C-alpha cells in the first residue's frame, strides 16, 4: 500500500531529480487525474460554480498587497522580465479577485462562485518532499465565493455539504473536523476575527458537526475549518479546508454595488475539497491498493483473442465498447492467452474479455475480473450496460 | 466588430492586465470555449490513438542545455532558482515527453508511441510585440510527439497530415497552404540526417497529393518542419499547423529502445501541433465567426425567458430540463421587455433564445428565436432538445433552418 511503489508498477507517474517535487503524469495516471476533474466538474455544475483559469505568474506587487510576500517569501518561486519581478502563483486567491474586479458588480451578481483547477508552485525544502504527498507543484480543486454578509451562512453550508458529498463518493465516511482561530501575526481587526470565527463555529454546529479548536493555526488573513478523512487503515488525511475571509478582497480593491446603491466590499469564502489533487490520487492509490474503482480505472476493459481467428471479432467489440464511452483496449499480440490475462490482471484492469471460437460463433464474450472471478460467457450488450451503470454511478465495487 | 479583443470584452471571454503581460485571465465563458476545444482535440486523440500525459512546469536548466535549446532560446526563457539550482519554465514540451519515454525499458513492440499533451508553455517575449490572444507570453499548445522506427516514419507522418485536414475542416477551414521549412544556417545535426528528414517530409506530402513550396532556412535548429497555413473568411493567412521530423533531440536526451535484432536503437521523434497556440486559435475563431461561435463552442447555447411572472415557474422547469440534457442553458427572468432581452442576448451571440408565453405553458412548447434575427416559431420542447443535441454532437457549423 505504498503509492510510490504502486504508481511505478501501474505506470501512473514518475519523478526525477531534474524536477524535484513535480510530477510527470504518464498516460494511465493522467487518466485518473482527468476523471477526478470530470467528477469535480459534475459537482461544480450541480452546486452552480463558474470555472475560470488564471495566469501562472503575476507581478510580485500583487502578493505584496495581500501580505503573502512578507509572510511566505521563502516558499514562492520568482522570475524576472524587463526589470520586473513576477511570482509563480502559490495560490489562486489574487487571480480570482482580478477576474472579479473586471466589470462593475452589483448585489444581483452575488453569490458569485468561482472555481479553478489551479496548479500552484511552492519552493518547499527538498528534504521534505515525499512522492505525491508533499510536492512542489500541485493542482488544487480551488474555489472562491464572493457574497454578502447575509449570504455567509448559506454559502458556508453549501461548502460543508459538498465536502461530505464528495468524500462519500470515494468511501470516506469517517471525517474529523477542526476550527483554526487567529494566529499571533495576522491582519484584520479583532471584531472581524470575532465574527469570522463565530460564523464558522455556528455553521459547524448548525450542520451537526462536532469539532475541536486549533488555537492560533488559522491563516494570517482568515480562520478556517479543516476536514480530515480516515482511510481504510484508519490513517488521518487532512484534505478539505473552508476559510471565511474578511480582509483580502479589501486589500485587492474588490467591491460591488449594494441594494442601497452603496459601495461595499464582498465577503470571500475560500474552499478546497480534495486539496492537492496529486496528493488525493496518492491517498486513493493506497486506499484501493491499486484496485481503482471502474470509473477511475485508467483502462476499464481489455479484450483479447485466443488465436488470429478471433482478431476481427475483438476489433469489432473494441470499437463497440469504445463508442459506448468505455476505456477499452484490444490485446492482439502473439502471446498465450494466459500470459495476456496475467499482464492485465497485474495492471488491475477491472474487466478482461476473452474471445474464442465459441464466443465468435455465439456473439457473446467471456468475462473475468482482476480479482480472479470468472463471470462466464455474457451477452455483449449486457456487458456494456453493466459497465455503463457501474461507471455512471461511480460505484466503489463491482455489482 | 471583428477584432477578437473587442468581441472578447463584449462576450466576457477573457481579460489581460499589466500585472501579467502576455498572460490571459480566462473568464467562465472564455474558459468554456477553451474546454470545448480540449474535448474536441481529445476526441481526435482517441480516434488517432494518442496517449495523453502531463509534464512538470519547470525542469533543470542542464536538461535544456543538452538539446541546445538553452543556447538558442535563453533570451526567451523564464528562469527561476531554488537551493542553488536554476530551473527553466518550459517553453516547449519536447524534453518532458522524452523523460516519460526514458522511464522503463522500451522495445520495438512499444512503437509507435504517440504522446500528446495540452502543454502550458511560457516564453519571455518582448512586451512591445504582445497583442491580444495572438502574441502572448503564456499559452497552451495541442502538442504531441511520436516515437517510432525509421520504417514507421511514413505512416506516422501521413497520420499527422490527415489529422491536420481533419481538424481544420471542423471549423470550416478548407483553404490550406503548405510549406516545407528546410535547414537554417545556425543548426545542429548531421547533413545526412537533415537530407533524410527533409526528403521524408517531402515524400509524405507527395503521397497525400499536397502541393507545397520550400521555405529555405526557416526550419527549427534541430529538425525541418511542414508548416500548414489556413485562410480565414477574410482570406487572411494564419500559420497554425506544424509537423517536424527530428533525428537530433532523442539522441541528445539518451532516448533508446531495443530493436527486433536485440540491439539498442535511437527512436525517431515526430513533433506535431495542429491548432498551435490554443489561445491564438480561439482568437482566430473569434474573428472568423465574428463572435457567432458554432453551437458546440458557444459559451451559452440557449437562453429561456419569460414575458411576465406567470411563466417564471415554467421557464425554470425547462432550464433544468435542458441542463439535464447536457445543454448550456440560462434563464432570463428579469422584469424587462422581451425585445430588450432578445437584443441583449443577440449581442451576446447566444445561438437560441426561447420565449415562453402563457400559450407556451399550456401547450408545453417554446417560441424559438435565433441570434441571426430569425423566428423559427413554436416547437415541442423535446423536439427542440433533440435537434440541439444533434447540432452539438455533430459540431455543426450551421444552426437550425439556415
Ligand atoms: Zn484562496
Ligand atoms: Zn516538440
Author numbering:
A (entry chain B): 242 to 640
B (entry chain A): 241 to 642
List sentences from the manuscript:
We noticed that Gly463 and Leu489 are two strictly conserved residues in the ThrRS proteins, but they are replaced by a serine and a methionine in the ObaOs, respectively. Therefore, the mutation of Leu489 to a methionine does not confer resistance of EcThrRS to OB. In contrast, OB showed poor activity against EcThrRS_G463S, with 5 μM OB inhibiting only approximately 10% of the activity of EcThrRS_G463S, indicating that mutating Gly463 to a serine renders EcThrRS resistant to OB. In contrast, cocrystallizing 300 μM EcThrRS_G463S protein with 600 μM OB did not result in an EcThrRS_G463S–OB complex structure. No electron density of OB was observed in the catalytic pocket of EcThrRS_G463S under this condition. The active pocket of this structure has neither an OB nor substrate molecules, so it is in an “apo state”. The conformation in this state is similar to the “adenylation state” of the EcThrRS_Y462F–ATP complex structure we determined earlier, but slightly wider. This structure also indicates that although G463S weakens ThrRS binding to OB, it does not disrupt the active conformation of ThrRS. In the EcThrRS_G463S structure, the hydroxyl group of Ser463 is 5.0 Å away from the phenolic hydroxyl group of Tyr462, which attacks the lactone structure of OB and forms a covalent bond with it. Thus, the sidechain of Ser463 is too short to clash with the presumably bound OB and it is also unlikely that Ser463 will directly affect the nucleophilicity of Tyr462 and prevent it from forming a covalent bond with OB. However, the motion of these two groups was positively correlated in the MD trajectories of the EcThrRS_G463S mutant, suggesting that the pocket of this mutant is relatively rigid.
